[PDB]
């Protein structure tokens, strides 16, 4: 009878620990007769394809539904008409009627009005989608998106080519939602729902109204806010009976800031703890630090659910050091390159395999090239198949400067790999047993990390022994039954 709604701004196929944690939690809840649905707030025309890939890749349970305002309001708008209305496409065809089409590239064409002596449009055509950029006085004023043969969205641009408005279209070709965009700030302003003839001040109010419509106001319905950016949307609903929880997935302290300052999003959640049923943390240490500053009484520790990988045959014969993460400053990748430089100096056979995507790619590439590590350190992009890549790693490392819990470290340990990790707040000190399943290193100590990496690369038997203890440690600490009991207590 308990229904859960796990809230994050968006879902995609190239995401990190938070999305993994949520999808795993949904699967375990569903095995315990508790519905675990995801709610997102962003527009993706291809959301069907993302969800299919997440299910077929075994990341997402087939029973885990995703609710989303664009999907919900489109399905309602679709009921209002029987036949497709071609007014928009006719308006475009009429605009370009006089215009001659000239191919610029393989996919790009331009429309020139011979009469007016002016270029009115650019068109880019792909397999599934066609984009039109419309121009007046050599300035773009609108973009039209065709997907699967129909207009799904239009965008309006000012004279600075900044987005000032977005319009969304139903499966019958009708406008059902439009919003103003602040051109410089790129923030969402007034939002208009065409069906209800209803106006909202901003995206928070619109998304809070969506939650009011989607979730019945009963105590057997639970909102779990995972995305810290989404917390204002769950706080500002008119629900009086629904249970509301916030999960803190990461160190709340300002990144690379020793002042004791706390991040704005996490500070907002923690200051408003009294307005919700509970704040869930992943470690006792994080709960302790939060209780000290915020004097919260509804704080709870529940570890992330973990997917126990199946025991496998280790065909290990390669000295590869593995690292799988979002390429973000949090992960201390410059410290990793420093460790790699020392390890490569004493063993040229050592490869460092870095899997993931992010802003830091160009910086790390420069560091690899600068230290002549192009042979030894390789950025291999995002993998939907992390398990297979880990199986061929000798050891996995973390240079991370902060965590909520090391899910990539846990994943490696479950696949019987030894781990070497900087001892950072709300991170690996819970599950890394220094000398038994891997090594806990003083933060930013390059030499100590490098030495233990070399010790493991030079001693396969020790590596295998530490690895088996790691798998056993994770199975013992993060038994799904214990976590299910903790969640069920919160729900009652
Ligand atoms: O190419 C890649 C790169 C990453 N991942 C996955 O991304 C996740 C990484 O999670 P984690 O190591 O925990 O890092 P974050 O993405 O930073 O996770 C955040 O959210 C998690 C959920 O609570 C917390 O455990 C972390 O501490 C917190 O930083 C893992 O499941 C990886 O398998 C891939 O699948 N492929
Ligand atoms: Cl094509
Ligand atoms: Cl203007
Ligand atoms: Cl602005």
Author numbering: 1 to 492
What does the published report state?
Staphylococcus epidermidis expresses glycerol phosphate wall teichoic acid (WTA), but some health care–associated methicillin-resistant S. epidermidis (HA-MRSE) clones produce a second, ribitol phosphate (RboP) WTA, resembling that of the aggressive pathogen Staphylococcus aureus. We report here that the TarM enzyme of HA-MRSE [TarM(Se)] glycosylates RboP-WTA with glucose, instead of N-acetylglucosamine (GlcNAc) by TarM(Sa) in S. aureus. Each blade of the homotrimer contains a catalytic domain with a canonical GT-B fold, consisting of an N-terminal acceptor substrate-binding domain (ABD; residues 1 to 68 and 202 to 302) and a C-terminal nucleotide-binding domain (residues 303 to 492).
The backbone amide and carbonyl groups of Thr383 form two hydrogen bonds with the O2 and N3 atoms of the base, providing specificity for uridine, and the aromatic ring system of the base is stacked against the Tyr382 side chain. The tandem backbone amide groups of Leu407 and Ser408 contact the α-phosphate of UDP-glucose and another main-chain amide group from Gly17 interacts with β-phosphate. In addition, the side chains of Arg326 and Lys331, each form two salt bridges with the β-phosphate. The glucose moiety contacts TarM(Se)G117R through multiple interactions. The side chains of Asn304 and His249 are hydrogen-bonded to the C6 hydroxyl group, the backbone amide group of Gly406 interacts with C4 hydroxyl, and the Glu403 side chain and backbone amide groups of Gly404 and Gln405 contact with the C3 hydroxyl group. The related enzyme TarM(Sa), which accepts UDP-GlcNAc as donor substrate, has a threonine at this position. The only difference is Gln330 in TarM(Se) and Thr330 in TarM(Sa), which clearly suggests a key role for this residue in allowing TarM(Se) to discriminate against the use of UDP-GlcNAc as a donor substrate.
